[PDB]
Ligand binder design. Structure first.
Ligand SMILES: [K+]
Ligand SMILES: [K+]
Ligand SMILES: [K+]
Ligand SMILES: [K+]
Ligand SMILES: [Mg+2]
Ligand SMILES: [Mg+2]
Ligand SMILES: [Mg+2]
Ligand SMILES: [Mg+2]
Ligand SMILES: [Mg+2]
Ligand SMILES: [Mg+2]
Ligand SMILES: [Mg+2]
Ligand SMILES: [Mg+2]
Ligand SMILES: [Mg+2]
Ligand SMILES: [Mg+2]
Ligand SMILES: [Mg+2]
Ligand SMILES: [Mg+2]
Ligand SMILES: [Mg+2]
Ligand SMILES: [Mg+2]
Ligand SMILES: [Mg+2]
Ligand SMILES: [Mg+2]
Ligand SMILES: [Mg+2]
Ligand SMILES: [Mg+2]
Ligand SMILES: [Mg+2]
Ligand SMILES: [Mg+2]
Ligand SMILES: [Mg+2]
Ligand SMILES: [Mg+2]
Ligand SMILES: [Zn+2]
Lengths: 98, 183, 46, 201, 307
RNA sequence: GUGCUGAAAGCAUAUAGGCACGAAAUUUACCUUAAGAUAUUUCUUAAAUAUACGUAAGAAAAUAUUACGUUAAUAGGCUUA
RNA sequence: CAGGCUAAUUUGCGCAAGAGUGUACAAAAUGAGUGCGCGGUUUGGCACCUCGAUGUCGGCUUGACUAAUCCUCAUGGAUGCAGAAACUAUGUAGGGUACGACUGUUCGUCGAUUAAAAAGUUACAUGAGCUGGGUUAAAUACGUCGUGAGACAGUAUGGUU
RNA sequence: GUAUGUCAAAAGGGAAACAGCCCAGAACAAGAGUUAAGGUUCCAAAAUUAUUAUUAAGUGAAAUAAAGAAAGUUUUUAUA
């Protein structure tokens, strides 16, 4: 194509740092909402699903913070910044093995 | 507005600074330990510092429109410190719009015709704003290959001690202690 | 001399060396062989 | 290195003088590394060299030995020069006392060699010029560097002698460069027993 | 940059402060470096100013017919010497002919006043290899300055051709004459390529313009005849310019200099024909001050009418 | 492309380090144009110098360039060869 | 038509592997069917720019550039480099690569010289520089097709540049 | 065709330049105000900011050329 969408294949240390803080800020939103309900002896099906099948920033591997699964790539991996609205979207889990 | 009211004669004057391209610089060197391993300021790291002085950006009254820059006398430009193999693998290009007239020259081959001072003028020239003050500021950079220069009397002094001299700091602290004896 | 991209030893006397590497270029990998001069190979162009 | 650890047996008559660290001011460089000037005097002459400072010499004048050692074996720069500085000192000691020699054999019909004097091209007073007739239309003549003695016991045999091996073996390579041994008849100039495998036909 | 790789201002003079005795590498550019890479080609002696008088043939005694150009010397003198300490290079200033005082300007009238030489018609510098090539001021150079068989280089201005087209100036082939050609017989045709080549006429494009009236050097011309009485120096071949035009004749740069004996014999002849060339100069230099100091005070009119 | 010394790696090695050979390319050299620092024991206190005008030209589309103007051979005429 | 995107394809190339040829012996030369790529010079695909207008195949004139090299210079390998010539390969684009017959021809065939008579890009460079033989208007004829008017990558003579 | 958004009809900051991408929805001014994307040696507002390794190729540094070769180098796991 002749239309230039200059998007580097990898992120910079400044983007990776902000990514770490966004993954860390969403963990505080779920921890606050979960602790607030626990004090009242309540539970939300959505909060129980997040804590069950989604890791925290301190539990994610570096390749899961800055990359996503893409079956069209040579090694089935693609920069997370190549995702639409990747800054305001949750993405932490990839297919097993890839 | 009172801050500016006063005598701005000395704030706009041209100061004649001096630096040696061979003296180790703990601030502009990437190696900071041990003491014997500290290197001089590299070409680009020295030019980045000079460009800031030629722009007068080190002054609290800096303005990009006013030419409040200063002079900088660089000596020992023959021993310009460079890393890697830049001296023999870096190339400078030229073209006068005539196809086929692409002139190329390496750093060492350029340091044989016009010395190391020409390599430092190209580095500082690219770090200056591209406007009508670029040639005036770059002209205030007086670079010499050795320790000799015609400005050994122009270099800024403080009590007879040239800045950068062995005992220039002591001569400054002695003049301020005398200025405190007044209301 | 045969310039290849995959140089390989063809006998026990072949030796891998990197010559012509100086302050201006990186050089090339050679396969020098004193026994058979047909085992001479190079990796890369000028 | 396994060669640097080997002490250097100084034979009788040889005298090693180790200087002190010095630095020659180079305006083109900001920091020169210190070196040590080593003088190796003896019967045949005197050779010199400047070794890096990280190489330390334990000159044992009692038992006439000198062992080399570096300040850090983990550095590639010091390991390399450790063995190289040892190999050069070995040639100096065994070159200032016994001397280095090189023999050149001229194979080929019509090949000759004689030592004469060419005052018109003398690089220094009394320089010897090896005259070579190697089939060229013109006469080949080369002046021996100052410090080498060239002789020809036979027309097809040259004998170079000198205290510096690098200078002796380098001059012999300049002579051989005129006729490199060919694989079809063995014609050429062989240096120190050099040989060539001929062809079948 | 403006000229080359140099970004230095044009009014700064830092040369004397970058010295080699201080331990720096000898520069590759500059007068000294330029004189070193031209020592083999720079002639040892000076040259003479001659006037192209015509063309003829030299007839040998056994049947040789050689074309040649006749060059005449008209009161050729050494006016001044250029030293490496004062000018940066070695050279000798040579004169030719004479000129009326009214036409000579006051600046040049005093230039010749401090030398004892009559006003000349032209001047030209001839570079020499070293100080041994400098000659005394005021000595006349005769055709015997050269010897028969000597090779020289003749420089001169070419014949003016005016505004020339493409055929006479660049040897263009032109176009057809009758096969349908329309108004384009001696024209240049295309002046470049389309958009893909710059959308412009490239610099250096060969186009019509003024031709001739430029300097041209003819090298390696032997000397066939030398006559002191007639004042001519017959050289083989052609020479640039018209008849009656001044030319510069000097030893060939692409040939070994003349024998050492000839260079000395000629220098020894200048001392015989002019035994006192410095005494006349010192006397002339002394008179300049006396008259120069009179012009300053304004009493010059008294010295004129002194006797 | 071809070498000498020589280790890392007891050997080997034209690999590091220390030296060198080597092409119609390159650079220099050579030629022209441009550039105009500089030189002269140079000139000038209202000038030096330059231009204009006239006779021209080694110049020539205009312009410019280069000479001359009576203390003068610039152009024409005339005389001689 | 040309440019742009793309690169199946090409009349453009490279690298890897090695069946096999080379009396012997894979890699002097040679290299089946393949794999991994470069390149943007062919035929295409798309229909993005231009239909209140981007003239087009060859020729002439005048260039500039690329280097995957026909000659010239340095040079490695060659049971298969004795020499000579030539083959192959690495450097290298300074210069040169002409003349004539045929065809509108690019191309190609051929004659005779030559150190050699190699290519490509630039709107398949260049028509506000020229030419107009071809292609592509009005006229006319042949053959073929059509009931016919007429049509035809069928062919002819002529035709405001 | 389908799902989501933007552009179209959306300016402003970042992507060197940019309809469609990352942020963010322009009523008008003031502020070393607070922040997003993005960045902090100089051009050019802000770190020549700290910590640990790797690279010596200017590789790379805001558009990853492939298979493949190799006494390049480092680490780890075996092993003498
Ligand atoms: K234009
Ligand atoms: K080689
Ligand atoms: K007709
Ligand atoms: K780069
Ligand atoms: Mg584009
Ligand atoms: Mg004329
Ligand atoms: Mg004609
Ligand atoms: Mg006509
Ligand atoms: Mg343009
Ligand atoms: Mg060894
Ligand atoms: Mg060896
Ligand atoms: Mg050489
Ligand atoms: Mg010239
Ligand atoms: Mg004066
Ligand atoms: Mg006047
Ligand atoms: Mg006129
Ligand atoms: Mg007359
Ligand atoms: Mg061979
Ligand atoms: Mg050339
Ligand atoms: Mg065209
Ligand atoms: Mg046109
Ligand atoms: Mg619409
Ligand atoms: Mg917008
Ligand atoms: Mg940026
Ligand atoms: Mg703030
Ligand atoms: Mg700043
Ligand atoms: Zn082998």
């Amino acid at each position: 194509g002749g239309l230039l969408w200059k998007i580097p294949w990898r992120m910079s240390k400044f983007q990776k740092l902000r990514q770490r803080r966004r993954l860390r800020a969403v963990d505080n939103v779920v921890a606050t909402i979960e602790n607030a309900l626990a004090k009242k002896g309540e539970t939300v099906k959505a909060v129980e699903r997040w804590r069950a099948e989604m890791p925290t920033e301190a539990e994610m591997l570096p390749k899961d913070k800055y990359t996503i699964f893409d079956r069209k790539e040579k090694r089935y991996r693609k920069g997370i910044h190549k995702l639409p609205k990747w800054t305001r979207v949750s993405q932490r889990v990839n297919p097993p093995g890839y | 507005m009172s801050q500016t009211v006063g005598a701005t004669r000395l704030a706009y004057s041209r100061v004649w600074h001096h630096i040696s391209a061979v003296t180790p610089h703990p601030t502009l060197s990437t190696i900071k330990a041990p003491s014997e391993a500290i290197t001089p300021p590299s070409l680009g790291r020295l030019a980045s510092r000079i460009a800031t002085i030629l722009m007068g950006k080190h002054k609290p009254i800096w303005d990009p429109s006013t030419d409040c820059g200063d002079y900088v006398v660089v000596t020992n430009c023959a021993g310009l410190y460079t890393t890697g193999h830049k001296k023999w693998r870096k190339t400078y290009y030229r073209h006068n719009t005539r196809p086929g007239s692409l002139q190329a020259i390496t750093m060492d081959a350029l340091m044989e015709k016009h010395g190391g001072a020409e390599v430092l003028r190209k580095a500082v020239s690219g770090m200056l704003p591209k406007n009508r003050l670029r040639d005036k500021r770059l002209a205030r950079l007086k670079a010499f290959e050795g320790d000799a220069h015609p400005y050994k009397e122009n270099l800024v002094r403080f009590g007879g001690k040239v800045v950068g001299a062995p005992g220039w700091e002591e001569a400054v602290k002695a003049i301020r202690e005398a200025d405190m004896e007044r209301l | 001399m045969k310039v290849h991209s995959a140089i390989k030893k063809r006998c026990e006397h072949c030796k891998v060396v990197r010559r012509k590497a100086n302050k201006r270029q990186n050089g090339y990998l050679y396969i020098i062989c004193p026994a058979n001069p047909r085992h001479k190979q190079r990796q890369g162009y000028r | 290195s396994k060669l640097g650890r080997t002490p250097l047996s100084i034979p009788p008559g040889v005298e090693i003088t180790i200087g002190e660290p010095f630095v020659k001011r180079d305006m083109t460089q900001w920091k020169q590394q210190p070196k040590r000037k080593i003088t190796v005097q003896g019967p045949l002459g005197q050779l010199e060299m400047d070794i890096p400072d990280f190489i330390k010499i334990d000159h044992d004048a009692e038992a006439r030995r000198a062992t080399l050692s570096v300040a850090n074996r983990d550095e590639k720069e010091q390991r390399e020069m450790w063995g190289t500085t040892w190999a050069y000192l070995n040639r100096f000691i065994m070159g200032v006392s016994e001397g280095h020699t090189a023999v050149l054999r001229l194979v080929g019909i019509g090949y000759r060699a004689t030592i004469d004097t060419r005052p018109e091209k003398e690089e220094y007073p009394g320089q010897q010029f090896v005259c070579l007739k190697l089939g060229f239309s013109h006469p080949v003549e080369m002046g021996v560097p100052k410090g080498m003695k060239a002789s020809t016991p036979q027309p097809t045999r040259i004998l170079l002698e000198g205290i510096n091996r690098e200078q002796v073996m380098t001059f012999a390579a300049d002579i051989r460069r005129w006729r490199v041994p060919e694989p079809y008849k063995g014609k050429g100039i062989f240096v120190n027993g050099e040989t060539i495998k001929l062809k079948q036909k | 940059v403006k000229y080359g790789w140099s970004t230095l201002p044009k009014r700064s003079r830092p040369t004397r402060f970058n010295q080699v005795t201080q331990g720096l590498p000898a520069p590759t550019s500059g007068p000294a470096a330029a004189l070193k890479r031209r020592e083999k080609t720079t002639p040892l002696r000076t040259g003479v100013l001659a006037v192209k008088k015509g063309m003829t043939v030299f007839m040998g005694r056994t049947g040789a017919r050689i074309p040649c150009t006749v060059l005449q010397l008209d009161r050729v003198q050494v006016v001044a010497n250029k030293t490496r300490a004062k000018n940066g290079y070695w050279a000798v200033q040579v004169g030719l002919g004479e000129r009326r005082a009214e036409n000579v300007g006051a600046p040049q009238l005093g230039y010749y006043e401090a030398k004892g030489i009559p006003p000349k018609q032209t001047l030209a510098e001839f570079k020499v290899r070293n100080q041994d090539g400098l000659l005394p001021v005021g000595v006349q150079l005769f055709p015997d300055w050269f010897h028969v068989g000597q090779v020289v280089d003749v420089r001169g201005i070419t014949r003016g051709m005016g505004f020339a087209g493409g055929m006479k100036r660049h040897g263009f082939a032109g176009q057809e004459a009758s096969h349908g050609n329309s108004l384009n017989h001696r024209t240049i045709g295309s002046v470049g390529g389309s958009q893909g080549s710059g959308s412009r006429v490239l610099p250096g494009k060969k186009m019509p313009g003024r031709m001739g009236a430029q300097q041209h050097t003819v090298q390696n011309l032997p000397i066939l005849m030398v006559d002191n009485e007639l004042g001519i120096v017959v050289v083989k071949g052609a020479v640039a310019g018209h008849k009656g035009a001044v030319v510069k004749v000097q030893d060939a740069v692409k040939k070994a200099p003349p024998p050492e004996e000839f260079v000395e014999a000629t220098k020894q002849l200048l001392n015989e024909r002019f035994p006192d060339a410095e005494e006349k100069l010192q006397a002339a230099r002394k008179l300049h001050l006396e008259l120069k100091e009179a012009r300053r005070q304004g009493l010059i009119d008294s010295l004129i009418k002194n006797g």
